[PDB]
Amino acid sequence: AGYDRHITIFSPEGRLYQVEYAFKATNQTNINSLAVRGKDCTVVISQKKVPDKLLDPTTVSYIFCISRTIGMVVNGPIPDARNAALRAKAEAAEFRYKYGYDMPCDVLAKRMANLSQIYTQRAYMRPLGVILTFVSVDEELGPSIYKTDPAGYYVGYKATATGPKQQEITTNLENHFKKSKIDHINEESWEKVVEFAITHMIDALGTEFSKNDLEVGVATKDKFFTLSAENIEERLVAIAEQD
Amino acid sequence: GSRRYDSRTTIFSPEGRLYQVEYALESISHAGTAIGIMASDGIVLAAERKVTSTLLEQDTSTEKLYKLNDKIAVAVAGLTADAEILINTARIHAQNYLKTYNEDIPVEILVRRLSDIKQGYTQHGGLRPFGVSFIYAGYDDRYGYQLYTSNPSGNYTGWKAISVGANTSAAQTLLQMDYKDDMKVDDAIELALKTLSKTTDSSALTYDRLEFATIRKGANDGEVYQKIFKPQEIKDILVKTGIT
Amino acid sequence: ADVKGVCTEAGMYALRERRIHVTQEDFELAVGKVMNKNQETAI
Amino acid sequence: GYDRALSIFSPDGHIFQVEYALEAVKRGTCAVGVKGKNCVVLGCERRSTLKLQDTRITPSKVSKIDSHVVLSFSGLNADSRILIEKARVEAQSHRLTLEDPVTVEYLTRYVAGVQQRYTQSGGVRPFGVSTLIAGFDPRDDEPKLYQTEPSGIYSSWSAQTIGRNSKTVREFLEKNYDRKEPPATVEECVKLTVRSLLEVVQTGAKNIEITVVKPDSDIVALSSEEINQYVTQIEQEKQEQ
Amino acid sequence: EFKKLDDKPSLVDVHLLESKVYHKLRNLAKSKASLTAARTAANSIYCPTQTVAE
Amino acid sequence: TTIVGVKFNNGVVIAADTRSTQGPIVADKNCAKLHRISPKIWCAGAGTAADTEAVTQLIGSNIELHSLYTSREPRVVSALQMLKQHLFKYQGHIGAYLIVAGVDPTGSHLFSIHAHGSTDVGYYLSLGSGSLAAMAVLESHWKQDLTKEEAIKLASDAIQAGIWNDLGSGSNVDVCVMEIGKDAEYLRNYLTPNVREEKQKSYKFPRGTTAVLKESIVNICD
Amino acid sequence: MTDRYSFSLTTFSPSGKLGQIDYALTAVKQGVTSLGIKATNGVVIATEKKSSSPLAMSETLSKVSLLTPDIGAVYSGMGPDYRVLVDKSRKVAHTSYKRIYGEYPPTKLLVSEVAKIMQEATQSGGVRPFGVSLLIAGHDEFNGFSLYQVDPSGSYFPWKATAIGKGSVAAKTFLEKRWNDELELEDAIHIALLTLKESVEGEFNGDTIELAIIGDENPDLLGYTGIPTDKGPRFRKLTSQEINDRLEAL
Amino acid sequence: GTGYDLSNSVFSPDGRNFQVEYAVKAVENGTTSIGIKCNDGVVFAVEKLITSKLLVPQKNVKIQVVDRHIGCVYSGLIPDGRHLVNRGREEAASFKKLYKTPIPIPAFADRLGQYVQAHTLYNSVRPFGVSTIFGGVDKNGAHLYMLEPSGSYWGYKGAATGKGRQSAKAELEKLVDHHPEGLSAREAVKQAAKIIYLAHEDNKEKDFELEISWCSLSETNGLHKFVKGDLLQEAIDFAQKEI
């Protein structure tokens, strides 16, 4: 009968309708973010939209530090993002306890994707409503950006976009990557990649940013942290005076 | 509420039969045909595998006949995937019987164990019934040769000649005329081959899509020899039956 | 119906070379074209 | 696992599953039983749709629960032998717990109880079988015949039949059997049971099976060569009178 | 070998070479037959521009 | 049973004897006491000879499964922690005494794990009942910046001291060396100080020396 | 609380065919067109990596995986379902054979054991069937090289040459003439490359083709030397550089 | 297909869960309740509606206390918030049992949000229909978070839910603008009384009753207690003065 579209069951076209509708829930916040991969570090920059003046800007953020070495940026409704953050932190804890060494980004991304797949396969569960971008630097592999989805399809990215204008930023970065033929930014300093990402994001969205519209996460060698507002203002001032 | 998505598998119809086993008995008819003939000297199990092509592997490939014990072999007609679990449980039960009594398990005990397994799902649990029906063949000192059959309903009866699967009625009508009470193994084998030739949906009868299992008792007494006819020996009986 | 298509295509092929009679090798061309179309449209 | 209730009280008061199981029983093979002074006879028929069913390994329609009490069923054959297994294991447990061979009344009560529980427990459809229990209590020669319905109601019957066309056999027993004057011999009981069967079976002497139960741990199964012997004089006495 | 082992991309070339050899031998009818067979095999595949030009 | 391990600049090397002793009596003269967890990590057991192979099989299966899951090489640290947890959860009821050596992209490593769960790390380490004699020798001869041939010679000297000074250690010498640059290679019967000499007389008996109560033949194949 | 979906989600249609099984078959027949063929001295299993976005890394995604150093797996259905299947199959294979018997199970028993999970998924209530179709290739010292195809229904069939995906019909109908009794590993890989050429619709190079071979026991990849009993893993996977050498061999 | 709102975990075609939206709409049919984040601590306030005079005054209370420094004020389905604050108290007790440090406010927020979303993942649980303005004082300072039935919480500088939710937020914005440098608790309690009075104008048909409570370091030194004595009357008649 018509109960196909309600639960995660196959459809006459061979489609999982619930998982398809889950993706449309990731654009509710219409927050555009992108992450580039530097020569030795990674930086992820996301729009920071504060709807009401009653909000405290410090607490509102879609960037969660999973561990001392792995950072994560998540797009979608925040409560499900926080559930995913809790599970990811707990699983990083469990892996560090059981194996004794800090886990690489790909392992965490694969485990969260497997969890989302278990969510999809079990009928009584509903799929996660978020899209998670795992970002970190792996001394065993190198800088890496990993993006999963509600279905569980994860794959490393040279540079990740998201939000309503994900396609436009994707082409904007693809033109640069296809003209420079390099798989990563050649800028050695984490200082330069931040301005590169901000400049490309500004040219893509066509908007000008202030101290509070954007939140930048930086993952250096064995260190992840979120820059404060003064840091973003200084970066924007440097960009404005440079170009 | 987890109710609207329930299908109520174990529900009595207004007139009073189950509906899931009703459609399982239709799924049986859409599977490959199998034939079982009870002869005085032995039992012959043959089946025609469905979906055959030049790229089908035949060197080591048995999908309709399965071995549960050195004396007892079964024929599968239906969904092979669901039949695999039943086969494994039957083998486990037979080995447990050998554990408990240190004597060959009679066919009726295993047939009951499998019928009970099917009935348990047809009764409670709200799960779909197994869409597979078996053909049981074996030997013992109790009743000699035995030839039962199974159903998704979980009922079993003894038969001197059965054929479950596609064109069951045609095969039964063909075999009932030619069935006597005194054939040897070869007469039953040629009768089964003729029945398969006259019931198949293709034109000719090539050795690729036919499987044979026979029970023979010769010089050695008390132990029968179970041989699954390989293609090299399978193509031999085709010329003997005249089909070639 | 493919046989009729083969015959009609052979007749057309004879016209393409501005000839007056249908030949066996034009029949080969027609049957090849008909087979190709039949096996392609099955996709 | 499955906790959903399958038997729900209908707005008219009946349970739909139980009253559907009644019809499921109504499609089963006819089974009849009568009792004499010291003999009880359970007669039954078999399906004649398909042939080439042997007799030796074919499961008997009347299953032996114990040496002194036997059971016959009608309706869905798949579910009935489960009740047979439960009754047998319960009889063995009763022997272990009370040091006494089981009685017909207690076994029938247990069967009615398990059918009632399946009509009560969630996630399980009611049994589609109707059972007849016959036998003799220890040190007692009185034949006891009991009928158990899928609804869980059990009663004693001097002569009861179940299955398809059970109304015809019931009305036949209502006039050719006397409750206050039972037949006095095993032969008379067998003759009455046979003559009752031809009212419905209408040929099929091959697939008419009859079990005769006697006291002092005596249960016999009459073969075909005796059933046709009775049928001979029964049909001889039918048309000439 | 290429008839049974259906290899039209190579059958085109072998038939074209056969037509060339037959033309060199002045047996024009067989050359025409080989060319027509190659044309039959040609217009069913992704034959490259070199072989269609030839 | 004597097992030793020496850590040098490029990699690490361990060694073991071949005599399995169940007490006052010797069971087998040539056995492989070295257990493989992964192609790059090796373990050698001591103490009880009946928990070592089972525990190493468990850890090898789980570690290779984990490496396949992570699509990367195994790490000695993960194996060490897993041995620690497994031995601790039984609460000291397993007397397995194991050595663990391995290399990884992070570098080279060598630890020891005790029966009740205790752990330690050192460049040289000998564990087991016969560990004393060899460990004294390696403490006497060891020095910084060893070479491959020097390391294997030191291991050979330690195992020779252990086999000469202890009853349960002897027969052949089994050595595994781990090289960061190249593949790890395994030496079978690297040293054979004990070789059984020929007997003075041959104890071959004439045919039919012992009477036969009954002759019979048992079938094998169908 | 728990799971209230204890009822089976696969119900027999009145036509006599399983819904979810015939639905997963449709979900399988669309997607990546993979293939695998068996030769005398080895088995080659090939698939094409459809790079979704050109900013992604197809290297991180493993279209083919290693069930055992002898047995590899190729799928043509849904990514995450195949990933979960391969993880579970590796775990249960370890549990069933490495723990109990001490070595790696052969292809025939491993395929039945992994299909056990899928044939339980179509049975256990509250879950949907896996939307993948598995191509299992493996070798053993007794039954030799063997290739098995696993359907979402749980049924597995032994096939000498196979293909599943969008181009399944064309590849299947084209492999009969390609294949014969005697074959070589390089012959088999050339056959696979030629077959996959038309079924690809994007850029053709070494990066967009995922190819693995089961051949002789190569000792270089074994990871240790000194044991004559074992000679290395038979399952090896070509990198982009390895495959873009036979790519122009066409 | 229809019936996308019958169940809970089902996604609508636009990707918005529907039972949560109905829970939100049920929240607004509740008594107004505001909270002010003063410089040193927080100041809660409730507008428990006086029904028929049979109800005993100054006895029924709605500002529930968690531990010592966390306060909970709830609107909407009052019992559902009762159960939510009960679970929150259990979590705080467990944390203090196995960490012996009083639960910090963001940690309590994480716990309550994870509990709330656990009830909007399944098909066998009704989402909570209560919005809370829980807050308090911890070591790092003061925090005031509003929780929503969708499971999303934010670090507000002031919030209010109820019938007069919209009116209350306007006066909250006016108060924030009037005192950008900050606000003292003593004036904050009077401002909260004024805000509640302005919000109650929508429900002037029924009688009102005001209860207020505040947690602070300057006076209450991290202890939560109500307002009793002359202070409550002073706030009441100050707020009635401008009317």
CSV table of C-alpha atoms in Angstrom, one decimal, chain F:
chain,number,residue,atom,x,y,z
F,1,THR,CA,61.7,-21.6,28.0
F,2,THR,CA,63.9,-18.6,27.3
F,3,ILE,CA,62.8,-15.6,25.2
F,4,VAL,CA,64.8,-12.4,24.8
F,5,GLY,CA,64.5,-9.2,22.9
F,6,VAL,CA,67.0,-6.5,21.9
F,7,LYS,CA,66.2,-3.1,20.5
F,8,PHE,CA,68.7,-1.5,18.2
F,9,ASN,CA,68.7,1.7,16.1
F,10,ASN,CA,67.1,0.6,12.9
F,11,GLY,CA,64.8,-2.1,14.4
F,12,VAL,CA,64.3,-4.8,17.0
F,13,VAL,CA,65.2,-8.5,17.3
F,14,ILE,CA,63.9,-11.3,19.5
F,15,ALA,CA,65.0,-14.9,19.9
F,16,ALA,CA,63.7,-18.2,21.4
F,17,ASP,CA,64.8,-21.8,21.9
F,18,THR,CA,63.0,-24.9,20.6
F,19,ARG,CA,62.5,-27.1,23.6
F,20,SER,CA,59.0,-27.4,25.1
F,21,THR,CA,59.0,-28.6,28.7
F,22,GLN,CA,55.9,-29.7,30.6
F,23,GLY,CA,57.9,-30.2,33.9
F,24,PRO,CA,60.7,-32.6,34.7
F,25,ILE,CA,60.2,-34.3,31.3
F,26,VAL,CA,60.6,-32.8,27.8
F,27,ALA,CA,57.8,-33.1,25.3
F,28,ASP,CA,59.3,-31.9,22.0
F,29,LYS,CA,62.8,-30.9,21.0
F,30,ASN,CA,62.1,-28.5,18.1
F,31,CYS,CA,59.0,-26.3,18.4
F,32,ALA,CA,58.1,-22.8,17.2
F,33,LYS,CA,57.6,-20.6,20.3
F,34,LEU,CA,57.3,-17.4,18.2
F,35,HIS,CA,53.8,-16.4,17.4
F,36,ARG,CA,52.7,-14.1,14.6
F,37,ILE,CA,50.1,-11.4,15.3
F,38,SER,CA,50.7,-9.6,12.1
F,39,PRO,CA,53.4,-9.8,9.4
F,40,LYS,CA,55.2,-6.9,11.1
F,41,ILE,CA,54.6,-7.7,14.8
F,42,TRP,CA,55.8,-10.9,16.5
F,43,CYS,CA,55.1,-12.4,19.9
F,44,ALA,CA,56.8,-15.1,21.9
F,45,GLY,CA,55.2,-16.7,24.9
F,46,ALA,CA,56.5,-18.0,28.2
F,47,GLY,CA,55.1,-19.3,31.5
F,48,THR,CA,52.3,-21.7,30.6
F,49,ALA,CA,52.6,-23.1,27.1
F,50,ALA,CA,48.8,-23.6,26.8
F,51,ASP,CA,47.5,-20.0,27.0
F,52,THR,CA,50.1,-18.5,24.7
F,53,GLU,CA,49.0,-19.8,21.4
F,54,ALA,CA,45.3,-19.3,22.1
F,55,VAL,CA,45.8,-15.8,23.3
F,56,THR,CA,48.1,-15.0,20.3
F,57,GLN,CA,45.6,-16.5,17.9
F,58,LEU,CA,42.8,-14.3,19.4
F,59,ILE,CA,44.9,-11.2,19.3
F,60,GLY,CA,46.1,-11.9,15.7
F,61,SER,CA,42.6,-12.4,14.4
F,62,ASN,CA,41.3,-9.3,16.1
F,63,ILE,CA,44.3,-7.2,15.1
F,64,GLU,CA,44.2,-8.2,11.5
F,65,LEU,CA,40.4,-7.6,11.5
F,66,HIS,CA,41.0,-4.1,13.0
F,67,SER,CA,43.7,-3.3,10.4
F,68,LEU,CA,41.4,-4.4,7.6
F,69,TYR,CA,38.7,-2.2,9.1
F,70,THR,CA,41.0,0.8,9.3
F,71,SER,CA,42.5,0.0,5.9
F,72,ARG,CA,46.0,0.6,7.3
F,73,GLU,CA,48.9,-1.3,8.9
F,74,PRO,CA,48.5,-2.6,12.4
F,75,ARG,CA,50.3,-0.8,15.3
F,76,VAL,CA,52.2,-2.4,18.2
F,77,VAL,CA,50.6,0.0,20.6
F,78,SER,CA,47.1,-1.3,19.8
F,79,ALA,CA,48.2,-4.9,20.2
F,80,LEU,CA,49.8,-4.1,23.5
F,81,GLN,CA,46.7,-2.4,24.9
F,82,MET,CA,44.5,-5.3,23.7
F,83,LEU,CA,46.7,-7.9,25.4
F,84,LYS,CA,46.5,-5.7,28.5
F,85,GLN,CA,42.7,-5.6,28.5
F,86,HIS,CA,42.3,-9.3,27.7
F,87,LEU,CA,44.7,-10.5,30.4
F,88,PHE,CA,43.2,-8.1,33.0
F,89,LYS,CA,39.6,-9.1,32.4
F,90,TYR,CA,40.4,-12.7,33.4
F,91,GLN,CA,41.8,-11.3,36.7
F,92,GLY,CA,45.2,-13.0,36.8
F,93,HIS,CA,43.9,-16.5,36.1
F,94,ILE,CA,46.0,-16.8,32.9
F,95,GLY,CA,49.7,-17.3,33.5
F,96,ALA,CA,50.7,-16.3,29.9
F,97,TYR,CA,54.1,-14.5,29.9
F,98,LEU,CA,54.5,-12.8,26.5
F,99,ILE,CA,57.0,-10.6,24.7
F,100,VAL,CA,55.8,-8.1,22.1
F,101,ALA,CA,58.0,-6.4,19.5
F,102,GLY,CA,57.1,-4.5,16.4
F,103,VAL,CA,57.6,-1.5,14.2
F,104,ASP,CA,55.2,1.1,12.7
F,105,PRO,CA,55.4,4.4,10.8
F,106,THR,CA,55.6,6.0,14.2
F,107,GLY,CA,58.8,4.0,14.8
F,108,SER,CA,60.0,0.8,16.5
F,109,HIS,CA,58.8,-0.5,19.8
F,110,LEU,CA,59.3,-3.4,22.2
F,111,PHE,CA,57.3,-4.2,25.4
F,112,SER,CA,56.6,-7.1,27.7
F,113,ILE,CA,53.3,-8.2,29.2
F,114,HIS,CA,53.0,-10.1,32.5
F,115,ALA,CA,50.5,-12.8,33.5
F,116,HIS,CA,48.3,-10.7,35.7
F,117,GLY,CA,48.4,-7.7,33.3
F,118,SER,CA,51.6,-5.8,34.2
F,119,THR,CA,53.4,-4.0,31.4
F,120,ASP,CA,56.9,-2.6,30.9
F,121,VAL,CA,59.1,-1.2,28.1
F,122,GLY,CA,62.8,-1.5,27.6
F,123,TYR,CA,65.4,-1.8,24.8
F,124,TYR,CA,66.5,-5.2,26.2
F,125,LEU,CA,64.0,-7.5,27.9
F,126,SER,CA,63.9,-11.3,28.7
F,127,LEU,CA,60.8,-13.0,30.1
F,128,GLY,CA,60.1,-16.5,31.4
F,129,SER,CA,61.5,-19.1,33.7
F,130,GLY,CA,64.9,-19.2,31.8
F,131,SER,CA,65.0,-15.5,31.3
F,132,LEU,CA,67.5,-14.9,34.2
F,133,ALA,CA,70.7,-16.3,32.6
F,134,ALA,CA,70.1,-14.6,29.2
F,135,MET,CA,69.1,-11.3,30.8
F,136,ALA,CA,72.2,-11.1,32.9
F,137,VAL,CA,74.3,-11.6,29.7
F,138,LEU,CA,72.4,-8.9,27.8
F,139,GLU,CA,72.7,-6.4,30.7
F,140,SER,CA,76.4,-7.2,30.7
F,141,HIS,CA,77.0,-6.7,26.9
F,142,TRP,CA,74.4,-4.2,25.8
F,143,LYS,CA,75.3,-0.7,24.6
F,144,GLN,CA,73.9,2.2,22.7
F,145,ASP,CA,73.8,2.3,18.9
F,146,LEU,CA,73.9,-1.4,18.1
F,147,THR,CA,74.0,-2.9,14.6
F,148,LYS,CA,72.0,-5.7,13.1
F,149,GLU,CA,74.8,-8.3,13.2
F,150,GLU,CA,75.8,-7.0,16.7
F,151,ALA,CA,72.2,-7.3,17.9
F,152,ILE,CA,71.8,-10.8,16.5
F,153,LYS,CA,75.1,-11.8,18.0
F,154,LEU,CA,74.1,-10.5,21.4
F,155,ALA,CA,70.8,-12.3,21.2
F,156,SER,CA,72.7,-15.5,20.3
F,157,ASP,CA,75.0,-15.1,23.2
F,158,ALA,CA,72.1,-14.5,25.6
F,159,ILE,CA,70.2,-17.6,24.4
F,160,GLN,CA,73.4,-19.7,24.5
F,161,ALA,CA,73.9,-18.7,28.1
F,162,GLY,CA,70.3,-19.5,28.9
F,163,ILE,CA,70.4,-22.9,27.2
F,164,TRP,CA,73.8,-23.8,28.8
F,165,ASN,CA,72.8,-22.7,32.3
F,166,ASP,CA,69.2,-23.9,32.4
F,167,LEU,CA,67.7,-27.4,31.9
F,168,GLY,CA,64.5,-26.4,30.1
F,169,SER,CA,66.3,-24.3,27.4
F,170,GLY,CA,68.4,-25.9,24.7
F,171,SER,CA,68.4,-27.6,21.3
F,172,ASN,CA,68.1,-25.1,18.4
F,173,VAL,CA,67.9,-21.3,18.3
F,174,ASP,CA,65.0,-19.4,16.6
F,175,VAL,CA,65.5,-15.8,15.8
F,176,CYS,CA,63.2,-13.1,14.3
F,177,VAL,CA,64.6,-9.7,13.4
F,178,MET,CA,62.5,-6.6,12.5
F,179,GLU,CA,63.9,-4.1,10.0
F,180,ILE,CA,62.2,-0.7,9.5
F,181,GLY,CA,63.4,-0.3,5.9
F,182,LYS,CA,63.1,-3.8,4.6
F,183,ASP,CA,60.8,-6.8,5.4
F,184,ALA,CA,61.0,-8.7,8.6
F,185,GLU,CA,62.7,-12.1,8.1
F,186,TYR,CA,62.5,-15.2,10.2
F,187,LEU,CA,65.4,-17.6,10.9
F,188,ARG,CA,64.7,-21.3,11.6
F,189,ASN,CA,67.3,-23.3,13.5
F,190,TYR,CA,69.8,-20.3,13.3
F,191,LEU,CA,72.0,-22.0,15.8
F,192,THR,CA,72.1,-25.8,16.5
F,193,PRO,CA,74.6,-26.4,19.3
F,194,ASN,CA,72.9,-29.7,20.2
F,195,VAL,CA,73.0,-32.4,17.5
F,196,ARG,CA,72.1,-36.0,18.4
F,197,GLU,CA,74.9,-38.4,17.6
F,198,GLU,CA,74.5,-41.7,15.8
F,199,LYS,CA,73.8,-44.8,17.9
F,200,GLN,CA,76.6,-47.4,18.4
F,201,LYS,CA,74.2,-50.2,17.4
F,202,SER,CA,71.1,-50.3,15.2
F,203,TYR,CA,68.0,-51.5,17.0
F,204,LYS,CA,66.3,-52.7,13.8
F,205,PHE,CA,64.4,-55.9,14.5
F,206,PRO,CA,63.9,-59.0,12.3
F,207,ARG,CA,60.5,-59.3,10.6
F,208,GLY,CA,57.8,-61.0,12.7
F,209,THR,CA,59.7,-60.5,15.9
F,210,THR,CA,56.5,-59.7,17.8
F,211,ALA,CA,53.5,-62.1,17.5
F,212,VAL,CA,50.2,-60.8,16.2
F,213,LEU,CA,47.0,-61.7,18.0
F,214,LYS,CA,44.7,-61.1,15.0
F,215,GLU,CA,44.9,-59.7,11.4
F,216,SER,CA,42.2,-57.4,10.1
F,217,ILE,CA,41.7,-54.6,7.5
F,218,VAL,CA,39.4,-51.6,8.0
F,219,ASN,CA,37.8,-49.8,5.1
F,220,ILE,CA,38.5,-46.1,4.6
F,221,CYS,CA,36.9,-44.8,1.4
F,222,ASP,CA,33.5,-45.5,-0.2
